[PDB]
Amino acid sequence: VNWSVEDIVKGINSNNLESQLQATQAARKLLSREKQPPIDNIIRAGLIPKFVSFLGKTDCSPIQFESAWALTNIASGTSEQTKAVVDGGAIPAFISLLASPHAHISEQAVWALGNIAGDGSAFRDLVIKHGAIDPLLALLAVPDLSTLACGYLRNLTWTLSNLCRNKNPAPPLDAVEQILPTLVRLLHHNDPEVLADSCWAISYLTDGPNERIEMVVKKGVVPQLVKLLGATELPIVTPALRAIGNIVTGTDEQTQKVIDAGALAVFPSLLTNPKTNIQKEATWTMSNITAGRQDQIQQVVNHGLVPFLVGVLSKADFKTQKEAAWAITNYTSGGTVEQIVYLVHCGIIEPLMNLLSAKDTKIIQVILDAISNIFQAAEKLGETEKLSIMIEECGGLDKIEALQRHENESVYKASLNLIEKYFSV
Numbered sequence: 001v002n003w004s005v006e007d008i009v010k011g012i013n014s015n016n017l018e019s020q021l022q023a024t025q026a027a028r029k030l031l032s033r034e035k036q037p038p039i040d041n042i043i044r045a046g047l048i049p050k051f052v053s054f055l056g057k058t059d060c061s062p063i064q065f066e067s068a069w070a071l072t073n074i075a076s077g078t079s080e081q082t083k084a085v086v087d088g089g090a091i092p093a094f095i096s097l098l099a100s101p102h103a104h105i106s107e108q109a110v111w112a113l114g115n116i117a118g119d120g121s122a123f124r125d126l127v128i129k130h131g132a133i134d135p136l137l138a139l140l141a142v143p144d145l146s147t148l149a150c151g152y153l154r155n156l157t158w159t160l161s162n163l164c165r166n167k168n169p170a171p172p173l174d175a176v177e178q179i180l181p182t183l184v185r186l187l188h189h190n191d192p193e194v195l196a197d198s199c200w201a202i203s204y205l206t207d208g209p210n211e212r213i214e215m216v217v218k219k220g221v222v223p224q225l226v227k228l229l230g231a232t233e234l235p236i237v238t239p240a241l242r243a244i245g246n247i248v249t250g251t252d253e254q255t256q257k258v259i260d261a262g263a264l265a266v267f268p269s270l271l272t273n274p275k276t277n278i279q280k281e282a283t284w285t286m287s288n289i290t291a292g293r294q295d296q297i298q299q300v301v302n303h304g305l306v307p308f309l310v311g312v313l314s315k316a317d318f319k320t321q322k323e324a325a326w327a328i329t330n331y332t333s334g335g336t337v338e339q340i341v342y343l344v345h346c347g348i349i350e351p352l353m354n355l356l357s358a359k360d361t362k363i364i365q366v367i368l369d370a371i372s373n374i375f376q377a378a379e380k381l382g383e384t385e386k387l388s389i390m391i392e393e394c395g396g397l398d399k400i401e402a403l404q405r406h407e408n409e410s411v412y413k414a415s416l417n418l419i420e421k422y423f424s425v
């Protein structure tokens with residue numbers, strides 16, 4: 001404990017496997033240090049090539065383990081540092097070690113690959129090209145997952161989620177297809193961490209174009225996502241909500257699967273969740289669902305979710321309120337006249353008008369857009385007057401006319417539009 005770099009270098013350069021082993025172990029402990037671990041000094045000393053060569057000493061499993069751990073400590077730092085480990089030839093060496101008869105050594109290799117793949121798209125794809133996926137999946141090829149050591153199972157799930165991570169580009173379609181069945185199995189495993197990381201992996205794969213959303217949804221995971229959406233553990237709910245949120249940016253049939261799985265019955269509690277980001281992401285998800293078909297809007301109505309949207313619009317973090325505004329504009333643009341009537345009876349007008357005094361230019365356009373849609377529904381019933389009166393009684397015109405002095409063009413036109421058509425002669 002507490003060796004200098006000079007001494008580690010000296011032991012590692014000796015012609016003595018045991019001396020090298022003690023020095024490597026000393027290096028790992030130094031790199032394990034919590035405050036200010038001298039990763040850059042270790043790299044500057046030229047130790048990484050030597051650590052990588054110790055990975056192949058199949059005759060001396062303890063120096064395999066120490067250098068794996070030392071190297072993983074470097075690889076779990078910055079991108080330059082991870083680059084240094086990769087530049088040392090570590091990826092093939094680590095993939096070879098997945099096959100090691102020592103679980104401790106196999107596990108380090110899993111964690112190493114996880115940190116390398118997790119650093120970015122190019123390294124993720126490099127790990128895949130070196131053929132990491134097959135021996136990783138082979139480590140989970142048992143009849144029942146419960147028979148694997150918990151920490152072992154957690155490390156493998158974490159590493160697979162990293163192979164699913166990042167965009168531009170997203171992972172190769174072939175690799176996603178190869179990984180997905182094991183992922184679906186992990187998503188049914190009873191361990192909070194395995195579930196959380198499985199959820200993350202799904203949320204990564206669903207974060208893109210509808211074809212990738214489809215690859216996931218064809219595998220029947222949506223009912224399991226909805227169940228996880230109801231969990232007590234925030235670290236499961238958070239990625240499950242993200243995945244559900246991604247899926248409803250897809251086609252109407254993809255969205256409908258989310259509704260069919262019973263997802264909307266969880267949203268009264270999500271739209272009032274004490275954690276700001278859950279509530280934000282729930283309202284975003286709602287805005288994509290109110291942008292769907294009229295029968296899908298009708299299910300939002302039937303689950304009693306409209307009062308909850310009115311509530312979030314009335315009081316919430318501003319970014320959440322911005323999402324609720326979108327949910328409303330999407331609802332009003334695609335909704336039937338009866339569905340828009342119902343929205344106004346729930347009390348949408350007053351908190352809609354109040355958000356017109358926000359100095360965020362975009363929410364103003366969104367709200368004015370929704371007001372226009374509601375008037376068009378009112379035009380079909382001849383309640384245009386009652387609507388104008390109602391808007392005027394909560395202070396709507398004060399906010400709408402003051403928006404004519406607004407130094408943004410798109411706002412002013414649509415602002416003046418309204419004052420003219422529904423508040424004149």
Ligand SMILES: CNCc1cccc(-c2cccnc2)c1
Pocket residue numbers: 284287288291323326330
């Ligand atoms: C014309 N499409 C409108 C639409 C559909 C679906 C979602 C959103 C959205 C835009 C910005 C923030 N949140 C949600 C907007």
